[PDB]
Design a protein around this motif. Structure first.
Motif, PDB file in Angstrom:
ATOM      1  N   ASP A  87       0.815  -1.213   0.000  1.00  0.00           N
ATOM      2  CA  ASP A  87       0.000   0.000   0.000  1.00  0.00           C
ATOM      3  C   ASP A  87       0.848   1.263   0.000  1.00  0.00           C
ATOM      4  OD1 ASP A  87      -2.150  -1.706   0.180  1.00  0.00           O
ATOM      5  OD2 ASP A  87      -2.951  -0.934   2.090  1.00  0.00           O
ATOM      6  N   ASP A  88       0.246   2.341  -0.496  1.00  0.00           N
ATOM      7  CA  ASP A  88       0.683   3.724  -0.297  1.00  0.00           C
ATOM      8  C   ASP A  88       1.777   4.194  -1.260  1.00  0.00           C
ATOM      9  OD1 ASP A  88      -1.137   3.640   1.834  1.00  0.00           O
ATOM     10  OD2 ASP A  88       0.345   3.997   3.391  1.00  0.00           O
ATOM     11  N   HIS A 111      -5.556   2.990  -4.303  1.00  0.00           N
ATOM     12  CA  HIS A 111      -5.552   3.256  -2.862  1.00  0.00           C
ATOM     13  C   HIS A 111      -6.001   4.694  -2.547  1.00  0.00           C
ATOM     14  CE1 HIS A 111      -4.860   2.003   1.153  1.00  0.00           C
ATOM     15  NE2 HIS A 111      -3.783   2.738   1.382  1.00  0.00           N
ATOM     16  N   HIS A 166      -6.058   9.745   0.520  1.00  0.00           N
ATOM     17  CA  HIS A 166      -5.857   8.899   1.699  1.00  0.00           C
ATOM     18  C   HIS A 166      -6.401   9.603   2.950  1.00  0.00           C
ATOM     19  CE1 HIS A 166      -3.904   5.850   4.272  1.00  0.00           C
ATOM     20  NE2 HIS A 166      -3.612   5.187   3.160  1.00  0.00           N
TER      21      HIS A 166
HETATM   22 ZN   LIG Z   1      -2.780   3.281   3.157  1.00  0.00          ZN
END
Ligand SMILES: [Zn+2]
Ligand SMILES: [Zn+2]
Ligand SMILES: [Zn+2]
Ligand SMILES: [Zn+2]
Lengths: 206, 206, 206, 206
Positions: free
Chosen positions: A9-10, A59, A63
């Motif tokens: 992720d990220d 994602h 965020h």
């Molecule tokens: Zn994340």
């Protein structure tokens, strides 16, 4: 058939090229959930993730918990992120990974919009807890992270949450690969044609 | 002879087709109390509810406590809802289900107008509490909701309050149908020609 | 190596002595996050919580989202609460539990102030949802709450959110203690000398 | 053993003397829950209920759902009602019967006030449904009411809800006494030293 789905992720970020090299050496395939701003910053890495057989999914753009769930922008942000990714890899991914997970942010109204937009949602079955060891000495951190993953891998299918923007996470991957291979797991990317539900709501439409 | 009257409020909505299929699958008949806006949005589902042997009644236009009770628009709203439903199914239902239940909203003055207008009012004998289970996995929610209904079904007549506009509610119905059948209940729709009073005011005129 | 951390919020209150007896009977240690007003109303219970091996921490003065997060009074309120508790038990606790959880109230600015002030922050890994079960029989509620906790306790470390100010919550604890013991969990209090991070922001500084 | 507790709500009234004659005739003892305004109107009947061995408890002053529960006057009204009864029978009864039952009106805050005030709460285990037959031919109505009660009497202790202000309820009592006696039931009055919990919350403090 035991399958381990490594998810990252990220990203992308400055450790991602290293991670891709490690995955290639072990002939492992994985899944990447990318943030819009980083797709814009790192197009070569996005292209490479797809080019080397990994799944590339969304994602979100911000965020940002308040924007995504309370203000209901989840689907709008995943759609926007989807278009940025499609501009690079030439297809529109359907799988999304909720920032902070789907529970409790992704309420019944948002889940309907996800389904109506033709999106899927994956949470995870194993949290590597890699963020705990941020800024700690990398070698000891990575081994602990490997341990977190290895000792929790008990089911035929496991979806493992890691973040490739942390150096200790990427450093942990060699041990995770050797260890899960010992347990009889193969390492595959998500495949849209082989979708199965993995989400905290147990919502089988997602 | 034991009869369970499943009653579904606030619809139709996006889970109602599935619910209708589940009821058909178990040859169960039920009762639906509809909100005017949703009657106008999902006329096809209204027609399906009546076509498949279920009773279709009124759950007001605004579902707003202040307008219905404080301002006394209850009968006006039920009459408006009635006409919208009549245009779809070709008959004018008489039974109403008060938003938030009759107690204390439906004061004596309003009960008098209900009776003068030829309407009936049904509250319930079991509250599934289904709408409250919206922060947990759907299957876990559904199981607890089924438990609430099953444990409290002890009388020869039970009127069960559910809401078909929530996913966990529709998911609970198979276990409820199975369980109450085991307890000796038959699942029937409300029948106008066989009215018996069910209301918190103990008013047998409604 | 499995440890369950029972955490009880919003107290003390009229059910807390009973809860303390239950925990003592099972030789279980837990963690309590107290509201200032209740610290002042029930000082003998605060003293008893600490005297009997449980960790006493802060849950603010006002429990008001706007004041704590929008107006940024979080650290000030936690410090005021800390002083009240210190005057009773002779320790100054460092661990805080955010009202409504840290996400998204505890923004980066506030997290910096938390860290600079020497405080720690715990969210949770399991939400019992206990406070939501207040419209049903207490024993029936307790059973469903225990189910929520037992079915979700799968990790080597679990932090369980409960509230000791609700009767159904305290009534659920015996089934929770019994069930998690069978699953191999030990019940311990938070220990400051052994802090590990548990928060939705994945911020390992607090 | 088997005990039936006939309980009569909302009185006294113009059929109560007849009901007392019937109870005496059958050597049956019962429980009466009185409304303040009728205690004022019918002091001889209150005296007579106590004189002939029945329990006299409280059923509030206003019988007003909004005042009792949402506005929280339950205990104040029961205490006021208690004083009126005490002025006639020379002692202060502790048992209350909630208008409309305790569920969901008697919330956790109100149950604490009940307990703190030294009061008890009895709901019921059998609803006679006597109100359904209001203003119908008394003979047939009484027979049906008797059936409602006799058919649902299956447990060693049963607490039966009736209203002695309805003529058809009083007319039903002979058949009920006959039928339950044949099923092995004794007809006893409530006594405070014989308390056992009978409330919808399963709150064993009440
Ligand atoms: Zn994340
Ligand atoms: Zn409604
Ligand atoms: Zn709280
Ligand atoms: Zn009454």
């Amino acid at each position: 058939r035991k399958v381990a789905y490594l998810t990252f992720d990220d990203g992308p970020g400055k450790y991602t090229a290293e991670l891709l090299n490690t995955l290639k050496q072990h002939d492992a395939k994985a899944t990447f959930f990318l943030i819009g701003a980083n797709v814009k910053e790192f197009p070569d890495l996005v292209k490479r993730e797809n080019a080397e057989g990994h799944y590339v999914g969304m994602h979100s753009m911000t965020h940002n918990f308040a924007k995504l769930y309370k203000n209901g922008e989840y689907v709008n942000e995943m759609k926007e992120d989807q278009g940025l990714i499609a501009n690079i890899i030439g297809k529109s991914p359907k799988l999304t990974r909720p920032p902070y997970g789907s529970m409790p942010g992704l309420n019944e109204g948002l889940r309907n919009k996800v389904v109506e937009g033709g999106f899927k949602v994956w949470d995870w079955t194993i949290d590597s807890l890699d963020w705990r060891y941020n800024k700690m000495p990398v070698d000891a951190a990575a081994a602990q992270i490997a341990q977190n993953v290895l000792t929790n891998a008990t089911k035929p299918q496991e979806v493992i949450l890691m973040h490739d923007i942390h150096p200790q996470s990427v450093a942990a991957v060699p041990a995770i690969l050797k260890g899960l291979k010992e347990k009889g797991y193969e390492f595959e990317a998500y495949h849209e044609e082989s979708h199965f539900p993995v989400n905290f709501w147990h919502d089988n439409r997602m």
